[model samples]
Target chain A: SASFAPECTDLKTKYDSCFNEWYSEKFLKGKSVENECSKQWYAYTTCVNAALVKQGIKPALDEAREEAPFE
Target chain B: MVLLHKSTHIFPTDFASVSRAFFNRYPNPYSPHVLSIDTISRNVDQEGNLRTTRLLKKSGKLPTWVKPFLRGITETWIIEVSVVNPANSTMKTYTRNLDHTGIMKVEEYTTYQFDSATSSTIADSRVKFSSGFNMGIKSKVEDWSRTKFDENVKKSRMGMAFVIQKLEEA
Candidate 1:
């Protein structure tokens, strides 16, 4: 999942670092209930959402969510 | 009837670390067939679960026996979906081929969870393979798929371990 929207690379990297740290130290270690990295993730994903929509794959993605066919 | 392959592997790491390595497993020496992986969608659900979808492109050589059935068929497009629930300490992933299904279709599902007793991460994977060829050749195709699936699983584990080693060093 290294690939990302061209416009969202910076945001993605910042959020990725923050989240990786939080995942390793806080969540994995059972220290915190609140997610400290949501803000950065939201900012980064907004750009990704726009990019997916522009590429006309957003609808298919949304539909994929509805089916839990993996069982 | 389709063939199903199920297996369980224990990694001496925590679930969080394994999940992180899952997304960063490409570009490893064991996975040279993976051309690229793109995160198509990612979001947090209302229940605090993280949902992600990725598109993986791969190209590899087919066995000599199967080459006669396909005319230059080597590349494949895979769509992977995962939902991670930290509260439940589990992550489930499903993947299927988006292209070249007429010859063979393989659907893989995996669950990553923490084993409280063992204090390690457990990965349970199930893969099902079916072919569109006539019944006479169906078993042959599935047998080939089963062999490839096992080999790919081994390579995938090695790739993940390599990624985790990098993460630990970082």
Candidate 2:
């Protein structure tokens, strides 16, 4: 997770952009790679999920959506 | 070297403020050193020794409380000596009782690059200031097996004693 990619100029900026790209092309588009960037993004996603959970909102990413559904 | 007392939290990054305070408080022909709480940090190692990183450098603006007092010092210098000088605080402590003695502990940071350069400057300034009042005796206390959060307090006190002894010799 600590590994950084040289593809982006700024490290933190690249991390943020990669997160958006991952959300759009991975879980949303059915393709996910759990790389460093993705791992950090997953952490952020998990945090957001927990916040929603606190508000009593249950959201299943993809596989969880199929099993849990909206109740 | 010109000597000054260092007070933590009150001056923080403002050296000029502390310097002014020292000059105004004593106004002795001797220049006082200014110190801050930030200068002292605990080492990760178990040594009880504390570290003093930076002495005095341009730390931007002084806090509001110190600003007025600082101005008084600057004015004191200009009016008394007819020269406007910029003063900054060091990471050293000042005591009212010159004869006070104790074990002073200064902590060292792991690898603070900025501190290396700034500390050098402070040491140089002090060495330059102590023409007659400058104590020549210098000692460093280093511990490898003990370190605590408030270790700087004790270590710095030791440092003060060493400084006092140096002055006494002169």
Candidate 3:
């Protein structure tokens, strides 16, 4: 599925595709798939993080963290 | 005061099936309130555990009575951070509402472990409902949210089952 922002959709799709394959074909199989989708994930997150900040969700996220930080 | 609820569900499927199903659980038949999910960060730790953080937006009708307290907001944003340990055959997720801490906050800690002997997935969850304010309606709000959370929790398991069936079919 595309991300919240259309601009990040392309990268998100690529990463999701790569992840879907790796999650089943390797990760769940208990195979050592060293960062199978690392590149794709990095690119997608880069775009999405900027979008989160732009949408003002970044601060909200931080505020929530103060209530109960997730480990 | 924090109202907490705990539950366990057994998915009659292999660990892999459950894992795949959960990773792709959204956009399914059950959860229409989920508007979007955006993965904001992801990484693999030195121990080979995969860590991921996501922002989720859900649209819902706030109870008419609590509208004034919640500023009449009809939608809520969520933060979900999870870690999947392939070796342990387990996944742990922490999710909380990012937009409603002033009046209420719903945080859930969920764990999924594969019962290898039975070839089933054991899903356990602990939900905490913290209604931070009380002008005489704290317990009521807590009770209401707990009921709603439990409802959603059941729906999620049904959704997981639905996804697992599809995964097996494919």
Candidate 4:
């Protein structure tokens, strides 16, 4: 989790050694955030869409409540 | 589906003193209204074992469709309320507001003078924490335990008994 500068005097050697060990060792690749998971917490969009079921309220997307704690 | 309600006896102090694993902290507990907790007895065990639990129906007079929602509620039955007379407890104890932001600083050092004398007729030294409710007049009086609460307290307790009344178009 710690990030280090690639070119420093004292830290450069330590970082180079760690980098060499990490590169030579067995590494497992991980993935990034998926789209379907991010879509689940899209509450404000869904709330506006739900409220839009009624009329006269101009579908104010910007003024809709924030999706802080999504259901 | 009837409207009977219930909870555990864990107070807020107990909640603060407990460990993280023992506490139910996953769900947000802060609510604008009275918090209620929903608990289920039956579930699959950690080792994929099926556990059976006795589920008894709480008794009440409300109809099936009018059942109260039991989920997302704080299960603490009573807030840690204390009523300390200056005789047994110190006067400094009166300066604490149990749970309110507007109470500001408690000036019991000055206010205690009024509460100390027995000759004075001011008998309102108690602190009360009750559940919040909002329903129709009939529902509040009959099903919400309003009348019994009225008998014990000097006035109606702090809560939104009924803020907004709903009207439907014919």
Interface RMSD of 1: 3.6
- By summed lDDT, the worst window of 10 consecutive residues in model 3 chain B runs over B131-140
Predicted complex 1: DockQ: 0.29
3 versus 4: better lDDT goes to: 3
lDDT of each: 0.76, 0.25, 0.79, 0.22
True contacts kept of 4: 0.00
For each prediction, how big is the interface RMSD?
Answer: 3.6, 27.0, 2.2, 23.5
Which is superior by TM-score, 1 or 3? Answer: 3
The deviation in Å at residue B93 for candidate 2 is: 68
Which prediction has more favorable lDDT, 1 or 4? 1
Residue B4 in candidate 3 has what lDDT?
86
lDDT for each residue of candidate 1 in B104-159, tens digit (9 for 90 to 100): 67888989998888989999999988765643456666677778888978997888
lDDT of 2 by residue, B1-170 (tens): 12222222221213332322322222122223221111111111222212211112111232344444333222110001011122121223221111101112221211101123343223111101112321222221111112322333343334433444343354
In what order do the candidates fall by lDDT, top score first? Answer: 3, 1, 2, 4
TM-score to true structure, per model? 0.78, 0.15, 0.90, 0.18
Decoy 1 TM-score against native: 0.78
**Highest DockQ, which number?**
3
Q: What is the lDDT of residue A69 in candidate 4?
A: 13
Evaluated on chain A only, model 1 obtains a TM-score of 0.80
Clashes of 1: 0
